[PDB]
Amino acid sequence: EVQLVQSGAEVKKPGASVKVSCKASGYTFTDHYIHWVRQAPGQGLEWMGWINPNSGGTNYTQKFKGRVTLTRDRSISTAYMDLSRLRSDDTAVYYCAKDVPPYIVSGWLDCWGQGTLVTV
Amino acid sequence: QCVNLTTRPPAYTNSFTRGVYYPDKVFRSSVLHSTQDLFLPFFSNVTWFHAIRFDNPVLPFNDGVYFASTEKSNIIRGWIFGTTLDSKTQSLLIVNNATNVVIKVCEFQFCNDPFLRVYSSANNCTFEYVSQPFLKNLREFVFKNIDGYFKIYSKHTPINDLPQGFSALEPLVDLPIGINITRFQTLLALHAGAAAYYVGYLQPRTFLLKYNENGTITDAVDCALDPLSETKCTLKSFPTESIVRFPNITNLCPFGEVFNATRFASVYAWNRKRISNCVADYSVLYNSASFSTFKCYGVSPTKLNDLCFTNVYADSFVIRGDEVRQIAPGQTGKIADYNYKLPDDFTGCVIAWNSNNLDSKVGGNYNYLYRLFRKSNLKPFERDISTEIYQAGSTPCNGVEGFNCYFPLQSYGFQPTNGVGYQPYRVVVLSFELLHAPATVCGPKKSTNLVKNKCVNFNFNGLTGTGVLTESNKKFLPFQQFGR
Amino acid sequence: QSALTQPPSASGSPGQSVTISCTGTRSDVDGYNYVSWYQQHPGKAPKLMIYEVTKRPSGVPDRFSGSKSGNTASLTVSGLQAEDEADYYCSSYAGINNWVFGGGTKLTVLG
Ligand SMILES: *[C@@H]1O[C@H](CO[C@@H]2O[C@@H](C)[C@@H](O)[C@@H](O)[C@@H]2O)[C@@H](O[C@@H]2O[C@H](CO)[C@@H](O)[C@H](O)[C@H]2NC(C)=O)[C@H](O)[C@H]1NC(C)=O
Ligand SMILES: *[C@@H]1O[C@H](CO[C@@H]2O[C@@H](C)[C@@H](O)[C@@H](O)[C@@H]2O)[C@@H](O[C@@H]2O[C@H](CO)[C@@H](O)[C@H](O)[C@H]2NC(C)=O)[C@H](O)[C@H]1NC(C)=O
Ligand SMILES: *[C@@H]1O[C@H](CO[C@@H]2O[C@@H](C)[C@@H](O)[C@@H](O)[C@@H]2O)[C@@H](O[C@@H]2O[C@H](CO)[C@@H](O)[C@H](O)[C@H]2NC(C)=O)[C@H](O)[C@H]1NC(C)=O
Ligand SMILES: *[C@@H]1O[C@H](CO)[C@@H](O[C@@H]2O[C@H](CO)[C@@H](O)[C@H](O)[C@H]2NC(C)=O)[C@H](O)[C@H]1NC(C)=O
Ligand SMILES: *[C@@H]1O[C@H](CO)[C@@H](O[C@@H]2O[C@H](CO)[C@@H](O)[C@H](O)[C@H]2NC(C)=O)[C@H](O)[C@H]1NC(C)=O
Ligand SMILES: *[C@@H]1O[C@H](CO)[C@@H](O)[C@H](O)[C@H]1NC(C)=O
Numbered sequence A: 001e002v003q004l005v006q007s008g009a010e011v012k013k014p015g016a017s018v019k020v021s022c023k024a025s026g027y028t029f030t031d032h033y034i035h036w037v038r039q040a041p042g043q044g045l046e047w048m049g050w051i052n053p054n055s056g057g058t059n060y061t062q063k064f065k066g067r068v069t070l071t072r073d074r075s076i077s078t079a080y081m082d083l084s085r086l087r088s089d090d091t092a093v094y095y096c097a098k099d100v101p102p103y104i105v106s107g108w109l110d111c112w113g114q115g116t117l118v119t120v
Numbered sequence B: 001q002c003v004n005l006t007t008r009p010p011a012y013t014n015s016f017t018r019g020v021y022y023p024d025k026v027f028r029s030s031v032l033h034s035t036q037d038l039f040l041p042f043f044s045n046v047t048w049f050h051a052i053r054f055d056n057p058v059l060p061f062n063d064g065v066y067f068a069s070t071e072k073s074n075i076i077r078g079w080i081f082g083t084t085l086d087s088k089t090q091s092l093l094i095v096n097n098a099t100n101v102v103i104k105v106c107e108f109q110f111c112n113d114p115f116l117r118v119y120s121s122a123n124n125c126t127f128e129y130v131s132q133p134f135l136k137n138l139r140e141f142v143f144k145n146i147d148g149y150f151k152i153y154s155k156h157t158p159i160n161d162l163p164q165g166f167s168a169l170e171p172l173v174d175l176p177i178g179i180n181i182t183r184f185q186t187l188l189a190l191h192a193g194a195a196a197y198y199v200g201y202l203q204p205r206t207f208l209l210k211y212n213e214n215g216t217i218t219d220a221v222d223c224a225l226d227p228l229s230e231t232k233c234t235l236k237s238f239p240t241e242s243i244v245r246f247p248n249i250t251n252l253c254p255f256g257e258v259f260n261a262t263r264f265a266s267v268y269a270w271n272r273k274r275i276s277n278c279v280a281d282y283s284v285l286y287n288s289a290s291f292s293t294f295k296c297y298g299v300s301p302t303k304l305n306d307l308c309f310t311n312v313y314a315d316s317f318v319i320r321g322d323e324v325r326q327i328a329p330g331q332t333g334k335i336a337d338y339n340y341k342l343p344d345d346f347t348g349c350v351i352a353w354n355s356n357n358l359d360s361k362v363g364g365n366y367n368y369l370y371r372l373f374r375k376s377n378l379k380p381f382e383r384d385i386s387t388e389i390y391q392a393g394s395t396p397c398n399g400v401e402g403f404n405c406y407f408p409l410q411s412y413g414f415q416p417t418n419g420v421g422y423q424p425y426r427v428v429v430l431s432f433e434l435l436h437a438p439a440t441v442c443g444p445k446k447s448t449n450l451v452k453n454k455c456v457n458f459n460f461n462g463l464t465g466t467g468v469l470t471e472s473n474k475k476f477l478p479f480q481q482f483g484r
Numbered sequence C: 001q002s003a004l005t006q007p008p009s010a011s012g013s014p015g016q017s018v019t020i021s022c023t024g025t026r027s028d029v030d031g032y033n034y035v036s037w038y039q040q041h042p043g044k045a046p047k048l049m050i051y052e053v054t055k056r057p058s059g060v061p062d063r064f065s066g067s068k069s070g071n072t073a074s075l076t077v078s079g080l081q082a083e084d085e086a087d088y089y090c091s092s093y094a095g096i097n098n099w100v101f102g103g104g105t106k107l108t109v110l111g
Helices: B226-233 B321-326
Strands: A003-006 A016-024 A034-038 A045-051 A059-060 A068-073 A078-085 A092-095 A116-118 B011-015 B029-041 B044-050 B065-067 B076-082 B089-094 B105-106 B108-110 B121-122 B128-129 B137-146 B149-158 B168-175 B183-188 B196-200 B203-211 B217-222 B294-297 B311-320 B349-356 B424-433 B455-460 B461-467 C009-012 C035-038 C045-053 C066-069 C074-077 C085-092 C099-101 C104-109
Touching: A034 C074, A045 A068, A045 C099, B011 B196, B089 B108, B089 B226, B137 B168, B226 C099, B294 B321, B311 B321, B321 B424, C035 C066, C045 C066
Parallel strands: C009 C104
Antiparallel strands: A003 A016, A016 A078, A034 A045, A034 A092, A045 A059, A068 A078, A092 A116, B011 B044, B029 B203, B044 B196, B065 B137, B065 B196, B076 B089, B076 B183, B089 B105, B105 B128, B108 B121, B137 B149, B149 B168, B203 B217, B294 B349, B311 B424, B349 B424, B455 B461, C035 C045, C035 C085, C066 C074, C085 C099, C085 C104
């Protein structure tokens, strides 16, 4: 069994920022790309962008460019997401994920996190 | 740092009786011996250069050379030898200093007219040597090159045009270089003044030498020069046990700087270390306990102390657990394909030992990588270090990590909890090479004892025999080691 | 990028079959097999049902079955129960190193 655990809720204002953590246990951390998804309270899921825990290369959606940044720390095996242009339409629930193929990217997101509620 | 200068009918002088060296290391007393070797004829015509106007031409090297000089001031330092002398073949340099005679065999790129500022680079330096310096008083040298051996003889006599008389040249150096020589050139030291030197060439001749009471040569006749001399040659006138003795064991070979290194390297960028001109003790790293694998192919473990090879190499890795079985002739499995492959006709040894107490950490080493994706398999002993992204599709990557553009470099994850099969094993591979050159790497040679006043066998330095040994009162010259 | 569309709603009779659809998927030889389907119950995390258009992962009964043809993928359910009261989301590739989801279909069974 694989476990993913996210941090707690946050409340900010349209000038503040936010950081979200994601701790992984039960498997080999650096053999799986990690994706980020968002869900507004009562709408459909929206994809954000991915990260390679081995190298560190990333890629985003062109809509989010300039405001989001993804990082990792392998010693404690955690992944962080930073957002710094909070507005009224950024209240949401944020999720982690995990790919099936080991050294390849493909959006077969099988095991999910638990969701962080950011009520800006 | 590369200057050119040349602003310029050589004369000819007799060499009356000059250039008679010691053919071999044997002590003959009060004898008239006959020899057939490369000697310089009698009453020839040697060439008298004074290259300082300034020009140091490149001269031929037909079978050897006799070189004489008489300048008191130290202007002439050393010589350069080579075949093409232009950055594409090996070359030899004997430039000496005020207290050293350093000799180098390297791949040089010389200037137009080098002087002491002579060369621009040195790629592969395959020899080295340091000892006391070689250098009105006449100084004369003889250079020969046979069977990969370079031989230098010399003498120094004070005088007050070459003199008349006799002087024999004593052996000075014998080197196992192995290069091919057919042209040479001298080099001068410029802060100058006129410098004169004499050059002559050797030929196959037959001589009759005279050894006096103490082992020294005092006269000789060339057997072609005169009808009279030919007549002088025809008239020849004007078991209990076994002891093995061998020289001491000094030049031990550096195996402690490979097996006891502070930090090793990855597997995709491994390391190579040329080993030559040493005495290898192969039975000190077998009779041990650290190594858990000593697999040897092509030889026998206990026959490595009686063989000599031209060259020996050494390769180093750090890998994990159950992959050491892929380092063998005829294997595969993603580390013998893209990282390190052994030839089919291997002649060497493989030694691997566990190092879990030095290459693991509580968080993770995350420092040792290996290749994972590649287009084709590796040829034997081929290294790849580039990091271009592996295109697995039709669309060019353009140097971005994405959909069908994999990153071909993955890191080992080490920590002090994994079972055997996941812990770091350090690996060292020894390879032997033998081709066309005199063998330098050799094992130790034992020595037994010395018993006197008994009938025993003996093997003094390779001169096997049987008899009785007792102390005598004869006095050899310093370089003579045979008797007779 | 692209934009996938699927009907807002669907329904079926207990014991019948439903055929929730999807369309707009990337249609190219190199990137054809990249479709996935997820199911979510209210107030929970989604679940994986079908990836690699017809491959199925462990833990889900054989009743759920995906398919694809031409430009459109599709899901197929059989033996409907009262448990299949959830919202289903399509997912696909969208060209420039980016994946996209769909609007969602609520699957309703009446008793
Ligand atoms: C060859 O070696 C022997 C002795 O081996 C070594 O010599 C010591 C100096 C030291 O290096 C130890 O590791 C070995 O014992 C030499 O014989 C010795 O020579 C010294 C010089 O005066 C003399 O004081 C000793 O008594 C000698 N040894 C004995 C046992 O009497 C020998 O000289 C070496 N060969 C040459 C050519 O020097
Ligand atoms: C690699 O090193 C080992 C360890 O030798 C040690 O080196 C220093 C760190 C220091 O602690 C010394 O006191 C140790 O000797 C070598 O193993 C030694 O081999 C010699 C051989 O005569 C033996 O006398 C020592 O007892 C050995 N040391 C131990 C700890 O067992 C080993 O030989 C070295 N590798 C090679 C190829 O020589
Ligand atoms: C995220 O990845 C995209 C990848 O776009 C593709 O890149 C090639 C593999 C090729 O297939 C292109 O036709 C695709 O568009 C990056 O977009 C490219 O980035 C580089 C540098 O800007 C360059 O190849 C093109 O300009 C971009 N292609 C475009 C705009 O269509 C993009 O840069 C990546 N984002 C980040 C933050 O790294
Ligand atoms: C002369 O040139 C040689 C060539 O390097 C050098 O001689 C030094 O000799 C001492 C004693 O053997 C050692 O330090 C080295 O062998 C040489 N020095 C260096 C730095 O390698 C030296 O450069 C010159 N001078 C002398 C006095 O030898
Ligand atoms: C041959 O060697 C012997 C011994 O080394 C020489 O005899 C010595 O010669 C020196 C110098 O001539 C004298 O000072 C000694 O007194 C001699 N010793 C004895 C015991 O006589 C001899 O001279 C050498 N012969 C030649 C031709 O050089
Ligand atoms: C050769 O050497 C001698 C020198 O005494 C003499 O015969 C002559 O000058 C030289 N040159 C030639 C061409 O003979």
